């Protein structure tokens, strides 16, 4: 019923588990969010998607605006009326998308000017220009704008980086603000920058804290850094943030990622993986990744997961699946799709009960042991 509020309900160290309560629904912490990129989540319809256990999903800034454009669809209603997806949606601000799949960038302090990858170019972007685009889409987790340090960045370079983003927090915070519809329905989440020195990312992290969010968001990993550079910035990261609000890790999503993540103290958690490697031929099981296109399979009667509850787990076998995926078919890449989405959705599951009942350490050692 609330706009936002976050309640955790039982913690284990770091790691803690809640449930963010907003207009649209509740989402329960740690939490996967599937990424939907054209306004669709690949191959799988909403009910499909809601089916599989996920309580929200990620809508992309810059690939909507681009197609079918944010003003088209808040004359057709809004994202979630035009997808089928009536619970909340986090949409990224645009930023990092821009800068990995626009032509020509053009960074300044006012913002970011570039070349749609596609058909000329829908041009400019700013913290305002990023907030309107979200309020138009009309997602519930709006996400500032900023600009994201790349890997490997210098001291200097990675200080004037988050230094320019903090500012842009500010810009986004107001923006955000200025908008009454906006301001009282949804929630504004801020993001950490800092590259992987704490110096930075304390002044990001008390900048953030000063101007105040909803939620804290940890950019600038999953760049390239590696997971023990990942784990070690998280580290000493993640307590920098209010403790009293959801953490959010920006793009990380092995499973590994996560549970090594929420292990210190991440509450959120989106990434194009299980989507991505579906259309593939990567599933994920308990027992690490399988490419289902590798000849073992093609008589294999066994489900994708002999422990799995899915869809795809409960009807079909590898075999099958197998087949589908080396013919090309559509109904592989929805059939996996389906079943990787699932999986995520069980791991996230499985951290939350064991963190209720105090043994997420325990839980976070077999799923290693087992999962290599
Ligand atoms: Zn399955």
Same mark, same amino acid.
């Given at each position: ?198 110096? /930075?990312? +304390?002044?990001?992290? =008390?900048?953030?804290? %000063?101007?105040? *969010?909803?939620?804290? $968001?940890?950019?600038?990993? @999953? ?123 069980? /791991?996230? +599951?499985?951290?939350? =009960?064991?963190?209720? %009942?105090?043994? *997420?350490?325990?839980? $976070?050692?077999?799923?290693? @042991?087992?999962?290599?």
């Amino acid at each position: 019923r609330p706009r936002f509020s976050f309640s955790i309900a039982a913690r284990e160290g770091k790691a803690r588990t809640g449930t963010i309560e907003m207009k649209r629904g509740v989402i329960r912490t740690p939490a996967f969010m599937p990424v939907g990129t054209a306004a669709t989540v690949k191959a799988l319809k909403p009910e499909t998607v809601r089916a599989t256990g996920a309580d929200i999903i990620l809508g992309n800034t810059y690939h909507l605006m681009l197609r079918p454009g944010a003003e088209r669809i808040a004359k057709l209603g809004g994202l979630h009326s035009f997808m089928g997806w009536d619970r909340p949606i986090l949409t990224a601000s645009g930023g990092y998308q821009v800068m990995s799949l626009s032509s020509l960038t053009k960074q300044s302090e006012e913002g970011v000017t570039f070349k749609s990858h596609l058909d000329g170019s829908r041009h400019m972007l700013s913290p305002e220009r990023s907030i309107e685009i979200q309020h138009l889409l009309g997602s519930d987790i709006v996400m500032a704008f900023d600009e994201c340090t790349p890997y490997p960045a210098t001291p200097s370079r990675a200080a004037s980086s988050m230094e320019r983003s903090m500012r842009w927090a500010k810009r986004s915070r107001d923006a955000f603000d200025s908008r009454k519809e906006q301001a009282e329905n949804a929630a504004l989440f801020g993001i950490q920058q800092g590259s992987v020195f704490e110096n /930075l990312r +304390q002044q990001s992290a =008390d900048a953030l804290a %000063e101007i105040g *969010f909803d939620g804290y $968001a940890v950019g600038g990993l @999953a760049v390239g850094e590696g997971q023990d550079e990942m784990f070690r910035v998280l580290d000493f990261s993640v307590p920098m943030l209010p403790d009293d609000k959801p953490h959010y890790l920006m793009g990380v999503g092995k499973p590994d990622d996560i549970v090594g993540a929420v292990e210190r103290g991440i509450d959120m958690f989106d990434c194009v993986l299980p989507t991505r490697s579906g259309r593939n031929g990567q599933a994920f099981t308990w027992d690490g990744p399988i490419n289902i296109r590798n000849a073992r399979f093609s008589e294999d009667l066994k489900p994708l997961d002999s422990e799995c509850h899915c869809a795809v787990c409960q009807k079909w076998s590898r075999a099958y699946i197998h087949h589908l995926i080396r013919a090309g078919e559509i109904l592989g890449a929805m059939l996996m799709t389906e079943h990787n989405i699932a999986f995520y959705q069980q /791991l996230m +599951q499985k951290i939350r =009960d064991s963190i209720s %009942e105090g043994r *997420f350490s325990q839980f $976070a050692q077999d799923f290693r @042991a087992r999962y290599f």
